[PDB]
């Protein structure tokens, strides 16, 4: 998160930190969010060989009594996800055990016009050449007209949101993928991708489009 501020600890109790084991070498990380006691939503490009989810975290290097660290038993990557276009950059993760709903760990509710102010949180980089943040950060970003994302060749307004005033430096960035975009307290987007140089806007998956797909997975599992 670029241009934001450290969250009040445990104030965003749906936030999930994902550690992803890859085929070769060290793990990668992403954000995500708890939507049912045993399901986390994130981005498809965060998939790997295995995933551990940490809920209840603030400083991801400081274990606390609030932590719930759970293995993923099934990755449900959207079946039309494509790495050329990054369309359908959404994945559901079924957890091996159900999370306990506590003050520090909870689910994010679901229910959006351009111009409105939204919020996004994550442990990603706090600048183009900065490391990821040990602490959860959040930033307020403007939902833009889709025209603002015209320079993204594969932008599709039916599938995606265009997020972040281009005249500011505030943005989601690397490591924030998978985290939710909240507008008026409900999930509207998922961080997907943006420019390598971090200049906003960035592209978010439009959750509303995927509600039927999500619901079918949830109903079956």
């Amino acid at each position: 998160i670029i241009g934001g501020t450290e969250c009040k600890p445990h104030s965003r109790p749906y936030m999930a930190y994902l550690e992803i084991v890859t085929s070769n070498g060290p793990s990668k990380f992403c954000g995500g969010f708890l939507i049912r006691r045993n399901f986390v939503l994130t981005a498809a490009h965060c998939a790997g060989r295995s995933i551990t989810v940490t809920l209840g975290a603030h400083n991801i290097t400081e274990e606390e009594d609030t932590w719930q660290k759970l293995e993923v038993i099934k990755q449900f990557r959207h079946p039309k996800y494509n790495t050329s276009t990054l369309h359908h950059d959404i994945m559901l993760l079924k957890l091996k055990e159900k999370a306990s709903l506590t003050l520090a760990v909870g689910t994010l509710p679901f229910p959006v016009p351009p111009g409105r102010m939204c919020r996004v949180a994550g442990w990603g980089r706090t600048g183009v050449l900065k490391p990821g943040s040990d602490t959860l950060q959040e930033v307020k970003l403007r939902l833009m007209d889709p025209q603002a994302c015209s320079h993204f060749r594969d932008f599709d307004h039916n599938l995606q949101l265009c997020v972040g005033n281009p005249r500011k430096t505030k943005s989601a960035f690397k490591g924030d993928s998978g985290g939710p975009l909240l507008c008026a307290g409900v999930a509207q987007g998922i961080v997907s991708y943006g420019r390598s140089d971090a200049k906003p806007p960035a592209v978010f998956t439009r959750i509303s489009h995927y509600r039927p797909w999500i619901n079918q997975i949830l109903q079956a599992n």
Partner: protein, 62 residues
Amino acid sequence: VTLFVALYDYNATRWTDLSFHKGEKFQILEFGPGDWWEARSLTTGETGYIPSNYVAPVDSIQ
């Protein structure tokens, strides 16, 4: 069967993608889904997408 080498330089435009130089080697983590592959650079240790038409398998092209 997962060790590949860059045939050209590439400057990433999406933050999900790797930048690389000709001659850089990679371990491919996933050969898709689509024409961009998830890879780890053996020069930098970073993971990200690379365009599959920019790389070739090291073992067979010598």
